[PDB]
Design a protein around this nucleic acid. Structure first.
Ligand SMILES: [Mg+2]
Ligand SMILES: [Mg+2]
Ligand SMILES: [Mg+2]
Ligand SMILES: [Mg+2]
Ligand SMILES: [Mg+2]
Ligand SMILES: [Mg+2]
Ligand SMILES: [Mg+2]
Ligand SMILES: [Mg+2]
Ligand SMILES: [Mg+2]
Ligand SMILES: [Mg+2]
Ligand SMILES: [Mg+2]
Ligand SMILES: [Mg+2]
Ligand SMILES: [Mg+2]
Ligand SMILES: [Mg+2]
Ligand SMILES: [Mg+2]
Ligand SMILES: [Mg+2]
Lengths: 101, 120, 94, 95, 18, 41, 55, 50, 140
RNA sequence: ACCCCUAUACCUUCUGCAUAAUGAAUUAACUAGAAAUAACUUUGCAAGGAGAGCCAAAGCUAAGACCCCCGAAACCAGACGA
RNA sequence: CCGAGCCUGGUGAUAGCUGGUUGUCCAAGAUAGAAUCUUAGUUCAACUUUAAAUUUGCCCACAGAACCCUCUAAAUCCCCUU
RNA sequence: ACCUCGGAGCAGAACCCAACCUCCGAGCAGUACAUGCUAAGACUUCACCAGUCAAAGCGAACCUCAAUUGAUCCA
């Protein structure tokens, strides 16, 4: 997925990450970074030296139960599942830019 | 009655105009086909379904490498309307033992031997 | 007022359908793919006498593996450990 | 076929099967050909010869006759001069 | 057979007009 | 034997610990439910 | 009627019947009921073999 | 008719497609269409069909 | 009556707790509640495809609105953004159109520049510079 | 909350039912798969098994697993009724 | 409520006919015909399911499968390689 | 009106293939009396029942035809 992130906010991603809670992580694959009065675009990704996005793992949980019901009429066809997918919450801490333009 | 169709061999005889339209060289032809299923076998006869199963094109848009030999060529001629055939070309050599892990099919048919993720 | 006899798309009198630009273009591009397939199926590499037995050994080995799998069928082994550790059902403080 | 009899609660046997067929202990049933003694004046010697044969039954027919008979008729018999003594066992049969 | 080069080899009533 | 040495641990055998050999007790099939009901075979 | 460890007996039986079969024999081990099941008929060979081992 | 056949400008011909079984079109066509070349439909003849 | 059912109430409640917000007799009567809850759960399962499709349609509508505000058309904007190797999806494109209008105007200007370069290329076959916001970056 | 978008109740019966084909107001309770021959699996013992009888050219013994509910118009016997 | 009364019993009469046949989840799974007082049913084939044993199964190439009149078609059978 | 059996077409080139579809027929006849006896291997009207061909051998001289038909019990 592509996320429009800024500093201080939260992102919910729908799977596990094999990280502990509180771990700080560098979010690579930055394709746009914009401030007031200017914007930098990648083709398709910006350079490693240019942008640096940091995110900390804040919560490892599961989703609310999702019902998967299958039904067909006049066929005695009825099935039901409940699924809870894993989820990780990431807090974006900082987005730094370097003069290497 | 609907039956299997036998194709005249004059269909599979390229002209110099065809050799100009496509980049194939009638001398030293290509060893391997890349074949990709691009059409479902539903509403198609059971023999075409079986031939697709034998060729291993059960999954659509998944490339499979095959020989350029008459037996498999007849097999492909049976279901030629459901698939795409391209030559497999090797810009570098064949994959070696120490470069077998880092390879990529790299559509346009060029099986590249080294696969970095950096711009040139 | 514009009424078609029963089951529009079957029978003697049917609702007419006409071919748009989409359908013609789709047919033409699939025909182009088929023509390129005809081209690439025109230059074989081993002329059908040179391919007489170049894979016989490997196909024989594959079927030998298939037969080995088909004949290596037997009930699994039975261990004292499972029967004895079913006793753990009533393991109290110790 | 009287799976349970009103007197003993036992399975019964169809006696037509016993009157018409012979069971070898291996599991094979032997019968006679139909019409083997009817209108022999319109039949060729080859047809009559193949009609005089004692032949084996189908797998389906064998299971049907086993169902229709009781296990008494499946025991191993040791008659004195049985002409079918050598046929009660199978030899050189593989699976 | 009818699809074979040797088809119609046993044709004789075209020879005997009788 | 190692089996009685294993039993030296292994809390005592009682009527709350017994269990048949797997494969001996085939499970009964009942005509209740979606799969085995509505026509019952 | 095996008594003691049965895996050594399985090893010995496999080593004995591998040359005769050309492949390792298909075998099931039952420790709780100390029996050894082998795929195929080898009754006379195994009887002679065990007699020679002295059982 | 011959002149129209030779100076036809599109590269896709009923004869070619039907005889090569392009797109698997023989499941819709008839065994007689290999010789009728799309010019005949039942008892009707199309003289502009090429 | 050996072993009749005792906890039928809990099964009835298992079905009925998903009908409390219904209307009519189907929020309390099991014989109708069960049918309507079955239909509701089937709808819940099938609604995921529609949610994806409808959210994409909303993104497309919003991007069309913003592009027409800048004078562009949606196909032109999407195609030329692809041709500039900037791979932003409809979601983030609508996000920027709503919350970063300066960035969206820059994106529309870049797409228009690439479109003009494509027209010039179709006119002149390159010869010389084949455009500046052309010249795709190669990877190996 | 509604307004927006998507969506032709269920069961049975059928080639095919939203069907304007059946059945059903609704709640509670009651209300419908019973077993053999022979096989399969798991034990015991083993040229023998089985607690008499029976089977046996690896068999025999034991266990497990397995075959619904409602409905005619009828027929007969004996009573009871002008 | 008499084309042959009513009640009880035989009687849980019989019904190839209609209706109904109750927890969860997963998996494989759509049939050429023959006979039948039989075509509203059943039995054997066929298809389908499970478990076992073993080795080939499908796709296929040359060569090959009377004639006769007038054509004799799309195709088929057989079939190593693959 | 038909119900069993055979030949042709439909059903064009292995097999099969419906119709209250189109056409022909059959329910015998003629000749030896080894038209004796046995016995590999096969075919098969889509099941079964029925039906079909046949080497070698023992004996003895040196079979036509398309259908031409009827199970069991019982007498
Ligand atoms: Mg209508
Ligand atoms: Mg129900
Ligand atoms: Mg109807
Ligand atoms: Mg409908
Ligand atoms: Mg209705
Ligand atoms: Mg009705
Ligand atoms: Mg009603
Ligand atoms: Mg009666
Ligand atoms: Mg009467
Ligand atoms: Mg009076
Ligand atoms: Mg009843
Ligand atoms: Mg009805
Ligand atoms: Mg499935
Ligand atoms: Mg009936
Ligand atoms: Mg047959
Ligand atoms: Mg002879």
């Amino acid at each position: 997925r592509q996320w429009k992130v800024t500093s201080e906010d939260l992102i919910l991603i729908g799977n596990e990450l094999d990280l502990a809670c509180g771990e700080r992580i560098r979010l690579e694959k930055v394709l746009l970074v914009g401030a007031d009065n200017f914007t930098l675009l990648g083709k398709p990704l910006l350079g490693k030296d240019l942008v640096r996005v940091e995110a900390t793992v804040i919560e490892k949980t599961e989703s609310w139960p999702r019902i998967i019901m299958r039904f067909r009429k006049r066929k005695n066809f009825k099935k039901k599942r409940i699924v809870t997918t894993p989820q990780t919450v990431l807090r974006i801490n900082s987005i730094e830019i370097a003069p290497c333009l | 009655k609907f039956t299997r169709s036998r194709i005249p061999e004059k269909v599979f005889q390229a002209s110099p105009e065809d050799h100009e339209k496509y980049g194939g060289d009638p001398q030293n032809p290509h060893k391997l086909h890349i074949v990709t299923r691009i059409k479902s076998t539903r509403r198609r006869p059971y023999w075409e379904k079986d031939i697709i199963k034998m060729l291993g094109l059960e999954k659509a848009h998944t490339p499979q490498v095959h020989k350029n030999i008459p037996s498999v060529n007849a097999k492909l001629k049976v279901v030629k309307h459901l698939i795409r055939i391209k030559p497999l070309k090797l810009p570098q050599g064949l994959p070696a033992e120490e470069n077998m892990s880092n390879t990529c099919l790299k559509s346009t048919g060029e099986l590249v031997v080294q696969w970095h993720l950096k711009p040139v | 007022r514009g009424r078609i006899p029963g089951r529009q798309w079957i029978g003697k009198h049917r609702r007419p359908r006409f071919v748009s630009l989409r359908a013609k273009q789709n047919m033409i591009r699939r025909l182009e793919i088929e023509a390129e397939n005809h081209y690439w199926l025109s230059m074989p590499y081993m002329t059908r006498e040179q391919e007489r037995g170049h894979a016989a050994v490997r196909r024989r080995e594959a079927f030998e593996a298939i037969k080995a799998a088909a004949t290596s069928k037997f009930p699994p082994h039975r261990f004292i450990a499972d029967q004895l550790d079913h006793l753990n059902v009533t393991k109290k403080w110790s | 076929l009287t799976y349970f009899s009103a007197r003993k609660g036992k399975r019964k046997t169809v006696k037509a099967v016993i009157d018409r067929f012979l069971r070898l202990h291996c599991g094979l049933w032997v019968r006679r050909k139909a019409g083997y003694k009817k209108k022999l004046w319109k039949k060729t010697p080859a047809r009559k010869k193949r009609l005089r044969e004692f032949v084996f039954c189908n797998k389906t027919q064998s299971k049907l006759l086993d169902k229709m008979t009781t296990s008494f008729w499946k025991r191993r018999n040791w008659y004195v001069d049985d002409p079918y003594q050598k046929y009660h066992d199978r030899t050189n049969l593989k699976v | 057979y009818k699809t074979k080069p040797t088809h119609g080899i046993g044709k004789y009533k075209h020879l005997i007009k009788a | 034997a190692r089996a009685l040495d294993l039993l030296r641990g292994l809390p005592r055998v009682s009527l709350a610990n017994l269990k048949p050999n797997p494969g001996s007790k085939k499970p009964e099939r009942r005509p209740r439910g979606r799969r085995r009901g509505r026509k019952c075979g | 009627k095996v008594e003691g460890d049965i895996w050594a007996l399985q090893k010995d039986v496999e080593d004995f019947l591998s040359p005769l079969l050309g492949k390792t024999p298909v075998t099931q081990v039952n420790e709780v009921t100390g029996t050894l099941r082998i795929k195929g008929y080898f009754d006379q060979e195994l009887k002679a073999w065990l007699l020679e081992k002295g059982f | 008719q011959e002149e129209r056949e030779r100076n036809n400008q599109n590269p896709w011909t009923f004869e070619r497609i039907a005889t090569a079984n392009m797109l698997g079109i023989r499941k819709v066509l008839s065994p007689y269409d290999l010789t009728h070349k799309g010019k005949y439909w039942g008892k009707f003849y199309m003289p502009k069909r090429v | 009556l050996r072993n009749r059912v005792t906890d039928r109430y809990f099964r009835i409640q298992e079905v009925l707790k998903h009908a409390r917000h219904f209307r009519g007799r189907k929020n309390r009567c099991y014989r109708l509640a069960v049918r309507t809850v079955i239909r509701a759960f089937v709808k819940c399962t099938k609604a995921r495809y529609l949610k994806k499709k409808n959210m994409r349609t909303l993104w497309i509508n919003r991007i069309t609105a913003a592009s027409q505000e800048h004078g562009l058309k949606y196909p032109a904007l999407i195609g030329n953004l692809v041709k500039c190797q900037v791979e932003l999806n409809r979601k983030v494109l609508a996000d920027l159109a709503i919350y970063e209008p300066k960035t969206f105007k820059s994106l529309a200007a870049l797409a228009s520049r690439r479109r003009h370069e494509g027209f010039a290329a179709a006119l002149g076959d390159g010869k010389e510079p084949e455009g500046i916001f052309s010249r795709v970056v190669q990877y190996h």
